[PDB]
Write a protein that binds this ligand. Structure first.
Ligand SMILES: Nc1ccc(-c2nc3ccccc3c(=O)[nH]2)cc1
Ligand SMILES: [Zn+2]
Length: 208
Protein backbone atom coordinates (compact mmCIF):
# COMPACT_ATOMS: atom_id res chain seq x y z
CA UNK A 1 0.00 0.00 0.00
CA UNK A 2 2.97 2.43 0.14
CA UNK A 3 3.71 4.85 -2.59
CA UNK A 4 6.70 7.22 -2.68
CA UNK A 5 6.27 10.73 -4.08
CA UNK A 6 9.42 12.60 -5.13
CA UNK A 7 9.72 16.15 -3.90
CA UNK A 8 11.24 18.71 -6.16
CA UNK A 9 14.24 20.61 -4.70
CA UNK A 10 12.31 23.73 -5.56
CA UNK A 11 9.49 22.77 -3.27
CA UNK A 12 9.39 24.48 0.15
CA UNK A 13 8.76 21.11 1.77
CA UNK A 14 11.98 19.63 0.27
CA UNK A 15 13.88 22.71 1.50
CA UNK A 16 12.57 22.69 5.05
CA UNK A 17 13.30 18.90 5.43
CA UNK A 18 16.79 19.43 3.97
CA UNK A 19 17.40 22.29 6.40
CA UNK A 20 16.43 20.12 9.41
CA UNK A 21 18.77 17.38 8.15
CA UNK A 22 21.75 19.72 7.60
CA UNK A 23 21.32 21.98 10.63
CA UNK A 24 21.15 19.11 13.15
CA UNK A 25 24.58 17.58 12.23
CA UNK A 26 26.93 17.55 15.18
CA UNK A 27 30.26 15.97 16.15
CA UNK A 28 30.11 12.64 17.95
CA UNK A 29 32.16 11.39 20.88
CA UNK A 30 33.35 8.44 18.77
CA UNK A 31 35.32 10.76 16.45
CA UNK A 32 33.24 9.42 13.53
CA UNK A 33 33.75 5.71 14.13
CA UNK A 34 30.11 4.67 13.78
CA UNK A 35 28.69 7.16 11.27
CA UNK A 36 31.69 8.63 9.50
CA UNK A 37 33.57 11.92 9.46
CA UNK A 38 31.45 14.76 8.03
CA UNK A 39 29.99 18.21 8.73
CA UNK A 40 27.26 18.13 6.09
CA UNK A 41 25.37 15.91 3.62
CA UNK A 42 24.74 15.82 -0.10
CA UNK A 43 20.95 15.33 -0.27
CA UNK A 44 20.16 13.23 -3.35
CA UNK A 45 16.38 12.76 -2.98
CA UNK A 46 13.54 13.39 -0.52
CA UNK A 47 10.37 11.30 -0.94
CA UNK A 48 7.08 11.54 0.87
CA UNK A 49 5.92 8.18 2.22
CA UNK A 50 2.19 7.74 1.49
CA UNK A 51 0.31 4.85 3.06
CA UNK A 52 -3.30 5.37 4.08
CA UNK A 53 -3.57 2.30 6.36
CA UNK A 54 -0.29 3.14 8.17
CA UNK A 55 -1.33 6.81 8.47
CA UNK A 56 -4.65 5.85 10.04
CA UNK A 57 -2.93 3.49 12.46
CA UNK A 58 -0.73 6.40 13.49
CA UNK A 59 -3.63 8.95 13.85
CA UNK A 60 -5.81 6.45 15.81
CA UNK A 61 -3.01 5.99 18.36
CA UNK A 62 -2.33 9.78 18.33
CA UNK A 63 -5.92 10.49 19.40
CA UNK A 64 -5.66 7.86 22.16
CA UNK A 65 -2.49 9.43 23.55
CA UNK A 66 -3.85 12.96 23.18
CA UNK A 67 -7.00 12.07 25.10
CA UNK A 68 -4.80 10.62 27.91
CA UNK A 69 -2.72 13.84 28.02
CA UNK A 70 -5.07 16.85 28.18
CA UNK A 71 -5.57 16.86 24.41
CA UNK A 72 -1.86 17.03 23.66
CA UNK A 73 -0.16 14.40 21.55
CA UNK A 74 3.27 16.07 22.00
CA UNK A 75 4.06 15.36 18.38
CA UNK A 76 7.61 15.90 17.05
CA UNK A 77 9.47 15.37 13.74
CA UNK A 78 12.50 13.22 14.53
CA UNK A 79 15.13 11.19 12.65
CA UNK A 80 15.36 7.45 12.44
CA UNK A 81 18.18 5.42 10.98
CA UNK A 82 17.96 1.67 10.61
CA UNK A 83 19.00 -1.18 8.39
CA UNK A 84 15.26 -1.86 8.17
CA UNK A 85 14.17 1.39 6.50
CA UNK A 86 12.71 -0.53 3.50
CA UNK A 87 10.57 -2.73 5.72
CA UNK A 88 9.53 0.27 7.85
CA UNK A 89 8.15 2.29 4.94
CA UNK A 90 6.18 -0.72 3.60
CA UNK A 91 4.95 -2.33 6.83
CA UNK A 92 5.09 0.38 9.51
CA UNK A 93 7.14 0.51 12.67
CA UNK A 94 6.74 -2.48 14.96
CA UNK A 95 8.72 -4.49 17.59
CA UNK A 96 11.18 -5.81 14.95
CA UNK A 97 12.51 -2.27 14.57
CA UNK A 98 13.25 -1.83 18.27
CA UNK A 99 16.80 -1.34 19.62
CA UNK A 100 16.80 -4.29 22.02
CA UNK A 101 19.99 -3.14 23.79
CA UNK A 102 19.12 0.53 23.97
CA UNK A 103 20.00 2.42 27.20
CA UNK A 104 16.32 3.15 27.76
CA UNK A 105 15.16 -0.42 27.05
CA UNK A 106 13.83 -2.27 23.99
CA UNK A 107 11.97 0.42 22.17
CA UNK A 108 12.10 2.33 18.95
CA UNK A 109 14.64 5.14 19.06
CA UNK A 110 14.60 8.54 17.39
CA UNK A 111 17.00 11.50 17.35
CA UNK A 112 16.78 15.31 17.01
CA UNK A 113 20.31 15.16 15.55
CA UNK A 114 20.25 13.70 12.06
CA UNK A 115 23.94 12.68 12.54
CA UNK A 116 22.94 10.53 15.52
CA UNK A 117 20.49 8.54 13.34
CA UNK A 118 23.13 8.35 10.64
CA UNK A 119 25.16 6.23 13.09
CA UNK A 120 22.54 3.45 12.76
CA UNK A 121 22.03 3.35 9.00
CA UNK A 122 24.38 0.33 8.62
CA UNK A 123 23.50 -1.13 12.02
CA UNK A 124 24.28 -0.60 15.72
CA UNK A 125 27.63 1.18 15.95
CA UNK A 126 27.57 1.48 12.15
CA UNK A 127 27.94 -2.37 11.84
CA UNK A 128 30.55 -3.14 9.20
CA UNK A 129 29.75 -0.05 7.17
CA UNK A 130 28.42 0.18 3.63
CA UNK A 131 27.66 -3.18 1.99
CA UNK A 132 29.91 -2.41 -1.05
CA UNK A 133 33.07 -1.11 0.57
CA UNK A 134 32.58 -2.16 4.25
CA UNK A 135 33.37 1.49 5.09
CA UNK A 136 31.46 3.21 8.00
CA UNK A 137 32.72 6.54 6.56
CA UNK A 138 31.90 5.76 2.93
CA UNK A 139 31.51 8.93 0.93
CA UNK A 140 30.32 7.09 -2.22
CA UNK A 141 27.43 4.89 -1.21
CA UNK A 142 23.88 6.24 -0.93
CA UNK A 143 22.39 6.27 2.53
CA UNK A 144 18.80 6.65 3.66
CA UNK A 145 17.24 8.11 6.83
CA UNK A 146 13.62 8.57 7.84
CA UNK A 147 12.26 11.87 9.12
CA UNK A 148 9.24 10.75 11.11
CA UNK A 149 6.19 12.14 12.86
CA UNK A 150 6.35 10.82 16.40
CA UNK A 151 3.83 11.02 19.22
CA UNK A 152 5.56 11.42 22.59
CA UNK A 153 2.59 12.09 24.82
CA UNK A 154 3.67 12.35 28.46
CA UNK A 155 7.38 11.62 28.17
CA UNK A 156 9.55 10.26 31.03
CA UNK A 157 12.61 12.51 31.40
CA UNK A 158 15.87 10.63 31.83
CA UNK A 159 18.88 12.79 32.53
CA UNK A 160 21.92 10.96 31.14
CA UNK A 161 25.26 10.81 29.31
CA UNK A 162 9.39 -4.42 23.21
CA UNK A 163 9.51 -3.13 26.76
CA UNK A 164 6.67 -1.09 28.25
CA UNK A 165 6.60 2.66 28.65
CA UNK A 166 7.24 3.75 32.23
CA UNK A 167 3.82 3.63 34.00
CA UNK A 168 1.71 6.79 33.44
CA UNK A 169 3.94 7.78 30.43
CA UNK A 170 3.88 7.33 26.65
CA UNK A 171 7.58 7.58 25.84
CA UNK A 172 11.00 8.27 27.29
CA UNK A 173 13.19 11.32 26.60
CA UNK A 174 16.98 10.91 26.90
CA UNK A 175 18.19 14.33 27.89
CA UNK A 176 21.89 15.00 27.15
CA UNK A 177 23.71 15.45 30.61
CA UNK A 178 27.47 15.71 29.69
CA UNK A 179 27.87 16.70 26.00
CA UNK A 180 26.44 20.20 25.96
CA UNK A 181 26.10 20.15 22.15
CA UNK A 182 23.97 16.93 21.96
CA UNK A 183 20.25 17.21 21.24
CA UNK A 184 17.68 14.88 22.83
CA UNK A 185 16.84 11.33 21.85
CA UNK A 186 13.44 9.67 22.38
CA UNK A 187 12.05 6.12 22.71
CA UNK A 188 8.54 4.90 22.01
CA UNK A 189 7.31 1.48 22.92
CA UNK A 190 4.45 1.20 20.39
CA UNK A 191 5.12 1.24 16.62
CA UNK A 192 1.81 3.04 16.13
CA UNK A 193 3.27 6.16 17.67
CA UNK A 194 5.51 6.94 14.68
CA UNK A 195 4.80 7.48 10.99
CA UNK A 196 7.76 7.38 8.56
CA UNK A 197 6.84 10.54 6.70
CA UNK A 198 9.96 11.32 4.63
CA UNK A 199 12.58 9.09 3.11
CA UNK A 200 15.81 10.97 2.60
CA UNK A 201 18.55 9.61 0.37
CA UNK A 202 21.96 11.15 0.88
CA UNK A 203 25.70 10.92 1.01
CA UNK A 204 27.92 12.13 3.86
CA UNK A 205 30.43 14.65 2.52
CA UNK A 206 34.19 14.55 3.16
CA UNK A 207 35.29 17.78 4.95
CA UNK A 208 37.67 19.87 2.78
N1 LIG B 1 18.18 -2.24 15.26
C1 LIG B 1 18.26 -0.88 15.49
C2 LIG B 1 19.00 -0.37 16.54
C3 LIG B 1 19.11 1.02 16.77
C4 LIG B 1 18.46 1.94 15.93
C5 LIG B 1 18.49 3.42 16.16
N2 LIG B 1 18.89 3.80 17.38
C6 LIG B 1 18.93 5.08 17.78
C7 LIG B 1 19.38 5.41 19.07
C8 LIG B 1 19.40 6.75 19.46
C9 LIG B 1 18.98 7.76 18.55
C10 LIG B 1 18.56 7.44 17.26
C11 LIG B 1 18.50 6.14 16.85
C12 LIG B 1 18.14 5.65 15.47
O1 LIG B 1 17.83 6.43 14.57
N3 LIG B 1 18.12 4.34 15.22
C13 LIG B 1 17.71 1.40 14.88
C14 LIG B 1 17.60 0.03 14.67
ZN1 LIG C 1 30.50 2.34 0.13
Amino acid sequence: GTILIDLSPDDKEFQSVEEEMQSTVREHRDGGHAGGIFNRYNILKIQKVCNKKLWERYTHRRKEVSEENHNHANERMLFHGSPFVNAIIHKGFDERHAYIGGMFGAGIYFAENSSKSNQYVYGIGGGTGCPVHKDRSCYICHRQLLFCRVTLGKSFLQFSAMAHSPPGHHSVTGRPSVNGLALAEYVIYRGEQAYPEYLITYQIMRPE
